[PDB]
Design an enzyme around this catalytic site. Structure first.
Site, PDB file in Angstrom:
ATOM      1  N   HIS A 134       0.750  -1.213  -0.010  1.00  0.00           N
ATOM      2  CA  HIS A 134      -0.048   0.048  -0.133  1.00  0.00           C
ATOM      3  C   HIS A 134       0.807   1.173   0.123  1.00  0.00           C
ATOM      4  CE1 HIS A 134      -3.678  -1.992   1.444  1.00  0.00           C
ATOM      5  NE2 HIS A 134      -3.165  -2.613   0.499  1.00  0.00           N
ATOM      6  N   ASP A 135       1.930   1.144   0.581  1.00  0.00           N
ATOM      7  CA  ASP A 135       2.888   2.276   0.373  1.00  0.00           C
ATOM      8  C   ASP A 135       3.626   2.535  -1.069  1.00  0.00           C
ATOM      9  OD1 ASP A 135       4.633   4.562   1.286  1.00  0.00           O
ATOM     10  OD2 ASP A 135       6.173   3.365   1.762  1.00  0.00           O
TER      11      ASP A 135
ATOM     12  N   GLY B   1       5.783   6.731  -4.341  1.00  0.00           N
ATOM     13  CA  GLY B   1       6.066   5.252  -4.562  1.00  0.00           C
ATOM     14  C   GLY B   1       6.361   4.864  -3.018  1.00  0.00           C
TER      15      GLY B   1
ATOM     16  N   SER C  93       5.081   7.247   2.852  1.00  0.00           N
ATOM     17  CA  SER C  93       4.081   8.359   2.799  1.00  0.00           C
ATOM     18  C   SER C  93       2.810   7.634   3.923  1.00  0.00           C
ATOM     19  CB  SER C  93       3.452   9.057   1.679  1.00  0.00           C
ATOM     20  OG  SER C  93       2.886   7.591   1.094  1.00  0.00           O
TER      21      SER C  93
ATOM     22  N   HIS D  68       0.021 -13.796  -0.616  1.00  0.00           N
ATOM     23  CA  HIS D  68      -1.260 -14.273  -0.188  1.00  0.00           C
ATOM     24  C   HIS D  68      -1.064 -15.672   0.310  1.00  0.00           C
ATOM     25  CE1 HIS D  68      -4.339 -11.163  -1.765  1.00  0.00           C
ATOM     26  NE2 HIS D  68      -3.327 -10.669  -1.002  1.00  0.00           N
TER      27      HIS D  68
ATOM     28  N   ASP E  72      -4.659 -19.677   2.459  1.00  0.00           N
ATOM     29  CA  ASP E  72      -4.196 -20.941   1.894  1.00  0.00           C
ATOM     30  C   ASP E  72      -4.013 -21.717   3.238  1.00  0.00           C
ATOM     31  OD1 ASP E  72      -1.396 -20.545   2.851  1.00  0.00           O
ATOM     32  OD2 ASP E  72      -0.546 -20.729   0.951  1.00  0.00           O
TER      33      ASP E  72
HETATM   34  C1  HEM Z   1      -4.208  -7.841  -6.917  1.00  0.00           C
HETATM   35  C2  HEM Z   1      -3.888  -6.940  -5.975  1.00  0.00           C
HETATM   36  C3  HEM Z   1      -4.302  -7.577  -4.430  1.00  0.00           C
HETATM   37  C4  HEM Z   1      -5.381  -7.457  -3.810  1.00  0.00           C
HETATM   38  C5  HEM Z   1      -6.563  -6.762  -4.421  1.00  0.00           C
HETATM   39  C6  HEM Z   1      -5.357  -7.827  -2.431  1.00  0.00           C
HETATM   40  C7  HEM Z   1      -6.388  -7.632  -1.554  1.00  0.00           C
HETATM   41  C8  HEM Z   1      -6.276  -7.807  -0.310  1.00  0.00           C
HETATM   42  C9  HEM Z   1      -7.200  -8.108   0.609  1.00  0.00           C
HETATM   43  C10 HEM Z   1      -8.843  -7.382   0.475  1.00  0.00           C
HETATM   44  C11 HEM Z   1      -6.829  -8.339   1.953  1.00  0.00           C
HETATM   45  C12 HEM Z   1      -7.529  -8.527   3.108  1.00  0.00           C
HETATM   46  C13 HEM Z   1      -7.174  -7.718   4.267  1.00  0.00           C
HETATM   47  C14 HEM Z   1      -8.063  -7.803   5.221  1.00  0.00           C
HETATM   48  O1  HEM Z   1      -9.373  -7.881   5.214  1.00  0.00           O
HETATM   49  O2  HEM Z   1      -7.376  -7.870   6.667  1.00  0.00           O
HETATM   50  C15 HEM Z   1      -5.563  -9.037   1.500  1.00  0.00           C
HETATM   51  C16 HEM Z   1      -4.786  -9.619   2.601  1.00  0.00           C
HETATM   52  C17 HEM Z   1      -3.139  -9.792   2.398  1.00  0.00           C
HETATM   53  N1  HEM Z   1      -2.587  -9.105   1.333  1.00  0.00           N
HETATM   54 FE1  HEM Z   1      -3.254  -8.588  -0.379  1.00  0.00          FE
HETATM   55  N2  HEM Z   1      -4.146  -7.958  -2.148  1.00  0.00           N
HETATM   56  C18 HEM Z   1      -3.455  -7.857  -3.495  1.00  0.00           C
HETATM   57  C19 HEM Z   1      -2.290  -8.141  -3.527  1.00  0.00           C
HETATM   58  C20 HEM Z   1      -1.039  -8.107  -2.360  1.00  0.00           C
HETATM   59  C21 HEM Z   1       0.158  -7.850  -2.710  1.00  0.00           C
HETATM   60  C22 HEM Z   1       1.074  -7.471  -3.727  1.00  0.00           C
HETATM   61  C23 HEM Z   1       0.646  -8.129  -1.201  1.00  0.00           C
HETATM   62  C24 HEM Z   1       2.249  -7.755  -0.748  1.00  0.00           C
HETATM   63  C25 HEM Z   1       3.061  -8.113  -1.403  1.00  0.00           C
HETATM   64  C26 HEM Z   1      -0.400  -8.468  -0.361  1.00  0.00           C
HETATM   65  C27 HEM Z   1      -0.359  -9.000   0.735  1.00  0.00           C
HETATM   66  C28 HEM Z   1      -1.161  -9.459   1.522  1.00  0.00           C
HETATM   67  C29 HEM Z   1      -1.357 -10.057   3.084  1.00  0.00           C
HETATM   68  C30 HEM Z   1       0.101 -10.420   3.550  1.00  0.00           C
HETATM   69  C31 HEM Z   1      -2.301 -10.038   3.393  1.00  0.00           C
HETATM   70  C32 HEM Z   1      -2.576 -10.656   4.801  1.00  0.00           C
HETATM   71  C33 HEM Z   1      -3.144  -9.615   5.724  1.00  0.00           C
HETATM   72  C34 HEM Z   1      -3.448 -10.225   7.108  1.00  0.00           C
HETATM   73  O3  HEM Z   1      -3.483 -11.513   7.368  1.00  0.00           O
HETATM   74  O4  HEM Z   1      -3.461  -9.493   7.996  1.00  0.00           O
HETATM   75  N3  HEM Z   1      -1.503  -8.426  -1.405  1.00  0.00           N
HETATM   76  N4  HEM Z   1      -5.070  -8.713   0.286  1.00  0.00           N
HETATM   77  C1  CYN Z   2      -3.186  -6.661  -0.179  1.00  0.00           C
HETATM   78  N1  CYN Z   2      -3.632  -5.559  -0.006  1.00  0.00           N
HETATM   79 CA    CA Z   3       1.441 -20.718   2.674  1.00  0.00          CA
HETATM   80 CA    CA Z   4       3.788   5.977  -0.626  1.00  0.00          CA
END
Ligand code: HEM
Ligand code: CYN
Ligand code: CA
Ligand code: CA
Ligand SMILES: *[C@@H]1O[C@H](CO)[C@@H](O[C@@H]2O[C@H](CO)[C@@H](O)[C@H](O)[C@H]2NC(C)=O)[C@H](O)[C@H]1NC(C)=O
Length: 336
Positions: free
Chosen positions: A48-49, A67, A71, A176, A194
């Site tokens: 997000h940053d 980027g 921020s 993820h 997962d």
């Molecule tokens: C196509 C883009 C992506 C979308 C739309 C997306 C969306 C989301 C959403 C909606 C959540 C759930 C957050 C919550 O309700 O707690 C999530 C969790 C997560 N995402 Fe993404 N994500 C994407 C890409 C990524 C990328 C590129 C990373 C970082 C390199 C990332 C890392 C994570 C992690 C580690 C969680 C788990 C958070 C937790 O367990 O507290 N995501 N993502």
């Molecule tokens: C994933 N934000």
């Molecule tokens: Ca895993």
């Molecule tokens: Ca930023």
């Protein structure tokens, strides 16, 4: 030779302060070097940053975002009001304190805390770590973070503008494999994405491809799809990206080799860590990052399901032969 006060050796004197913030983060933020919620929240924060960066906004005469500039911490008052930034305030404040106490820039601190957090999770690659990003930032523009209800075209366009190809978007999603959700369906808080939320592996790619069979909670939450077994949550954007013809073959190639997945993810993260910066102006301090413990488990289709249960979506390559497990269907506990 560059020896730091603690007696470690490094490439440059600018790296020595990072051995002190390593100690503080491992003992305090990560509660004894664990791979739990603080690592998962830092991985949302680094994305997000860094993604608040838009060349198309700059081209149109608007501020396009700095980027990977920190921020989200320096201007948290405006950025945490964005829809995609919920459930991050406590983590942002803990990071603010470490940055202020150690005199390091916020943009660098987020990148460092990501490499260190991943080193606590079995199976992780050693991420590159560059230091030198200016601490000065302007607030990110709104609407630059992809959301789970967006179409694959909207996600590929937004990520494409930031600089990533469709393949790099799939590579970046390996994060993820260490994930859960808290705000999409609060009734099943911390439901994993997962079956191994504490191991960086290929299971996320395998399991999003399985046929959606189970409703894990009392109702369906925002952008929620049926998942393959009790306790697992499936996000709509992940389900769609696994099946869309523009990303399906790269998603399928990520299912059988933890080694290939790790290399591709490390490359995509290095590119994301310098959005808004010139990497030739930064100093490499990657030798400060420790090795993660190795993951010795092989990719598997869990709980008795077979290849007949995955919805093969890459029309050119046949699905890899993945091992099967003679189990009853699993039910996942919440991520720790
Ligand atoms: C196509 C883009 C992506 C979308 C739309 C997306 C969306 C989301 C959403 C909606 C959540 C759930 C957050 C919550 O309700 O707690 C999530 C969790 C997560 N995402 Fe993404 N994500 C994407 C890409 C990524 C990328 C590129 C990373 C970082 C390199 C990332 C890392 C994570 C992690 C580690 C969680 C788990 C958070 C937790 O367990 O507290 N995501 N993502
Ligand atoms: C994933 N934000
Ligand atoms: Ca895993
Ligand atoms: Ca930023
Ligand atoms: C990076 O810039 C931020 C300001 O955006 C600095 O953060 C402030 O630091 C002072 C004391 O150093 C604190 O009292 C403020 O509360 C902080 N503000 C915010 C918004 O967090 C930070 O010190 C700067 N860091 C360096 C090393 O220059």
């Amino acid at each position: 030779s560059v020896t730091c006060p603690g007696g470690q050796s490094t490439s440059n004197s600018q790296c020595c302060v990072w051995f002190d913030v390593l100690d503080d983060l491992q003992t305090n933020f990560y509660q004894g070097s664990k791979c739990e919620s603080p690592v998962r929240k830092i991985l949302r924060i680094v994305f997000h940053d860094a993604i608040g960066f838009s060349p198309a906004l700059t081209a149109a005469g608007q501020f396009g975002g700095g980027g990977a500039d920190g921020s989200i911490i320096a201007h948290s008052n405006i950025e945490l009001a964005f829809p995609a930034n919920g459930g991050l305030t406590d983590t942002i404040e803990a990071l603010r304190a470490v940055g202020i106490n150690h005199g390091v820039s916020f943009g660098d601190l987020i990148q460092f805390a990501t490499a260190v957090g991943m080193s606590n999770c079995p199976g992780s690659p050693r991420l590159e770590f560059l230091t030198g990003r200016s601490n000065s930032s302007q607030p990110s523009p709104p609407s630059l973070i992809p959301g789970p209800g967006n179409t694959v075209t909207a996600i590929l366009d937004r990520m494409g503008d930031a600089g990533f190809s469709p393949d790099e978007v799939v590579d970046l999603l390996a994060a993820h494999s260490l994930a859960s959700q808290e705000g999409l369906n609060s009734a099943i808080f911390r439901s994993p994405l997962d079956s191994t939320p504490q191991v960086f592996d290929t299971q996320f790619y395998i399991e999003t491809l399985l046929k959606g069979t189970t409703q894990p909670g009392p109702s369906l939450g925002f952008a929620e799809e049926l998942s393959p077994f009790p306790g697992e949550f499936r996000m709509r954007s992940d389900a769609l990206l696994a099946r869309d013809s523009r990303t399906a073959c790269r998603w399928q190639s990520m299912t059988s080799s933890n080694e290939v997945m790790g290399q591709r993810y490390r490359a995509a993260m290095a590119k994301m860590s310098v959005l808004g910066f010139d990497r030739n102006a930064l100093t490499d301090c990657s030798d400060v990052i420790p090795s993660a413990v190795s993951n010795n488990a092989a990719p598997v289709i869990p709980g008795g399901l077979t290849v007949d249960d995955i919805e093969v979506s890459c029309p050119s390559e046949p699905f890899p032969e993945i091992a099967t497990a003679s189990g009853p269907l699993p039910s996942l506990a919440p991520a720790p």
